[PDB]
């Protein structure tokens, strides 16, 4: 009776209690779906902070990647979950991890205008010279689309 798939969907849906039960019966905390996403990936995507935290205290690989090279920090920074961003960083998330499109968490936080998450990532040593596979840094992105608030935060 495999609990991997049901741990994945409970974490996607924010069922905090089912999350605890399924782990209590040996559910693979680092289970992967077809695309390589883990429960932590899906809890971080959908903003389920306490499920993010619980998975991190029970052996979740904070820097796991799916087939497209995405880590939990990428998606949290893309969707804009600040609290989850900081939890992941305090548990050793690779702030400069690169996916298959050359993007770092800072790139995604920059595109989507999550300026507070931008600042958190900067204070944790995000590489401002990290280029995507079009050669664009996060700063190039803020210049190209005229985001003056974002440009000022990146030059500090």
């Amino acid at each position: 009776s495999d609990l991997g798939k049901k741990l994945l969907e409970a974490a996607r849906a924010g069922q905090d209690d089912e999350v605890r039960i399924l782990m209590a019966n040996g559910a693979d905390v680092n289970a992967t779906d077809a695309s390589g996403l883990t429960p932590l990936h899906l809890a971080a995507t959908y903003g389920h902070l306490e499920i993010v935290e619980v998975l991190l205290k029970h052996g979740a690989d904070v820097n796991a990647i799916d087939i497209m090279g995405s880590t939990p920090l990428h998606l949290a920074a893309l969707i804009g979950h600040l609290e989850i961003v900081e939890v992941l960083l305090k548990h050793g998330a690779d702030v400069n991890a690169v996916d298959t499109w050359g993007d770092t968490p800072l790139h995604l936080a920059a595109i989507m205008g999550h300026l507070e998450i931008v600042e958190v990532l900067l204070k944790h040593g995000a590489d401002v010279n990290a280029q995507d596979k079009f050669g664009k840094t996060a700063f190039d992105i803020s210049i190209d689309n005229g985001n003056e608030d974002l440009a000022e935060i990146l030059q500090k």
């Binding site: 695309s35 995405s70 998606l75 893309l78 969707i79 989507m112 992105i141």
Partner: peptide
């Protein structure tokens, strides 16, 4: 388009 692609590439 850049924001759409950012989301769409990760199929969020």
């Amino acid at each position: 388009s850049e924001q759409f692609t950012a989301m769409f590439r990760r199929k969020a």
